[PDB]
DNA sequence: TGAAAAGGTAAAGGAGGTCTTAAGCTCGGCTCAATTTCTCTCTTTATCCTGTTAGATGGTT
């Protein structure tokens, strides 16, 4: 297969330069503009390499790297740190983050490609983020576009179950079995209650839900806009 | 057009986890006698070396 590289950087210009140069080198590149989305993508995709900028918003690059090292699924993924390199203290804190390498900005493209090759020569399953939602399992929270929403455990698990089947209709019996482990024949009415809470937290108008749709006779569907349309929905 | 038939919403109540205090304990620190190691001297043995002037001169079992 083509090696998967995850680039995590809030500088869209650096992110684009890197992505273009890696694609020219034949890799499958994935991009993330912030540390939370980057972490979710790393967990979901298990990329073959992570390039990790230092100064990401809401979550510093060090905390992201440490969390990747704490997850058994990502602990072995090589981390090439992108750093603005200027103070020995960021040096000292990176010395504990478990980074595999550092690359100082500005970098030569050839050096970047050399490091990518060396890390790859050395190395040799749940959707947690789609469009406007990051799910934050560790905190039972959802990032919905740019707002934090606190969820209860059952509401979170229900929303995750729907996210796993984004764009498909999920039957109430499947929700009972997967989230509650209950028999298909138990009362599904309880689910109907908790679904509205998600709408209460997530829809702009709970009476005219746009994203948590009801498929009459079939169940519930989470339909999310593609990332290309997000700019039209945030104002809502 | 009337009528199932499903899907919502707003409660009441419970279930469950998370907080608050009076009772009691026991745990470490602090002091402070009370001592076992340590490290020098200071000896004191433990071990080896050399010499001995009457005369003597072939085995037991």
Neighbours of A51 (CB within 10 A): 29
Are residues A78 and A69 in contact, defined by beta-carbon separation less than 8 angstroms? Answer: no
Q: Identify which of A195, A220, A229, A223 has the alpha carbon closest to the alpha carbon of residue A210.
A: A223
What phi and psi, each to the nearest 5 degrees, are found at residue A142?
-120, 130
Residue A118 CA to B31 C1' — how many Å? 63
Resolution of the experimental model, in Å, one decimal: 3.7
| Protein-to-nucleotide distance from the CA of A84 to the C1' of B49, whole angstroms | 84
- C-alpha pair distances (Å), A105 with each of A60, A62, A111, A112, A210: 17, 17, 11, 10, 43
Largest CA distance in chain A: 63
The answer to whether A169 touches A218, Cβ cutoff 8 Å, is yes
The span from the CA of A186 to the CA of A189, in Å, is 9
For A116, how many CA atoms within 13 A lie in the half-sphere containing its CB?
Answer: 28
Distance CA A20, CA A14 (A): 10
Closest by CA to A136, choosing from A150, A124, A122, A146, is A150
How many angstroms separate the CA of A193 from the C1' of B18? 25
Torsion of CA A149, A7, A72, A227, to 10 degrees: 30
Please provide residue A102's backbone torsions phi and psi, each rounded to the nearest 5 degrees. -130, 145
Which nt is closest to the CA of A209, judged by C1'?
Answer: B8
| A18 contacts A52 by C-beta, under 8 angstroms | no
| Closest by Cα among A76, A71, A24 to A50 | A76
Kindly give the pairing relationship between strand A212-215 and strand A141-144.
unpaired
Can you read off the two tokens belonging to residue A193?
């209650």
Both structure tokens of A179: 């989230």
Burial class (CB in 10 A: 0-12, 13-18, 19+), A44: middle
CA distances from A118 to A19, A79, A100, A105, A193 (A): 18, 12, 11, 19, 53
3-state per-residue secondary structure call for chain A: CCCEEEEECCCHHHHHHHHHHHHHCCCEEEEECCHHHHHHHHHHHCCCEEEECCCCCCCCHHHHHHHHHHCCCCCCCCEEEEECCCCHHHHHHHCCCCCCEEEECCCCHHHHHHHHHHHHHHHCCCCCEECCEEEEHHHCEEEECCEEEECCHHHHHHHHHHHHCCCCCECHHHHHHHHHCCCCCCCCHHHHHHHHHHHHHHCCCCCCCCCEEEECCCEEEECCCCHHHHHHCCCC
Over the Cα atoms of chain A, what is R_g?
20
Q: Reading across the β-sheet that carries A141-144, which strands appear in turn?
A: A129-130, A133-136, A141-144, A147-150
**Distance in Å, residue A141 CA to nucleotide B22 C1':** 39
Give the C-alpha separation, A5 to A29, whole Å. 5
Method: cryo-EM
Strand B neighbours with CB under 7 A?
A: A 172, 189, 192-193, 195-196, 199, 206-207, 214, 216-220
Say if residues A50 and A120 touch (Cβ distance below 8 Å).
no
- Rounded distance in angstroms from the CA atom of residue A32 to the C1' atom of nucleotide B61: 111
B chain positions with any atom within 7 Å of a protein CB:
6-11
Q: How far apart are CA A236 and CA A234, in angstroms?
A: 5
- Distance (Å, whole) CA A214 – CA A197: 14
Encoded tokens for A40: 């979710």
């Amino acid at each position: 297969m083509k090696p998967r590289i995850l680039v995590i950087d809030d500088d869209s210009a650096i992110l684009e330069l890197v992505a273009v140069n890696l694609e020219m080198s034949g890799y499958d590149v994935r991009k993330a503009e912030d540390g939370i989305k980057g972490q979710a993508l790393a967990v979901q995709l298990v990329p073959d390499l992570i390039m990790l900028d230092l100064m990401l918003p809401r979550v510093d690059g060090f905390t992201v790297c440490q969390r990747l090292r704490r997850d058994e699924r990502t602990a072995e993924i090589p981390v090439l740190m992108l750093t603005a390199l200027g103070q020995t203290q960021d040096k000292v804190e990176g010395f504990n983050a478990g980074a595999d390498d550092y690359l100082t900005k500005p970098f030569e493209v050839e050096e970047m490609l050399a490091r990518v090759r060396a890390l790859l020569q050395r190395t040799d399953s749940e959707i947690l983020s789609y469009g406007p939602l990051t799910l934050i399992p560790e905190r039972f929270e959802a990032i919905w576009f740019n707002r934090t929403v606190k969820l209860t455990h059952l509401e979170f698990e229900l929303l995750h179950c729907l996210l796993q089947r984004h764009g498909q209709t999920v039957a109430p019996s499947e929700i009972l079995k997967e989230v509650w482990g209950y028999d298909p024949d138990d009362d599904i009415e309880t689910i109907r209650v908790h679904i509205r809470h998600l709408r209460t937290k997530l829809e702009p108008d709970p009476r005219h839900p746009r994203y948590i749709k009801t498929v009459y006779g079939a169940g519930y569907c989470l339909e999310l806009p593609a990332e290309t349309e997000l700019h039209q929905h945030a104002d809502q």
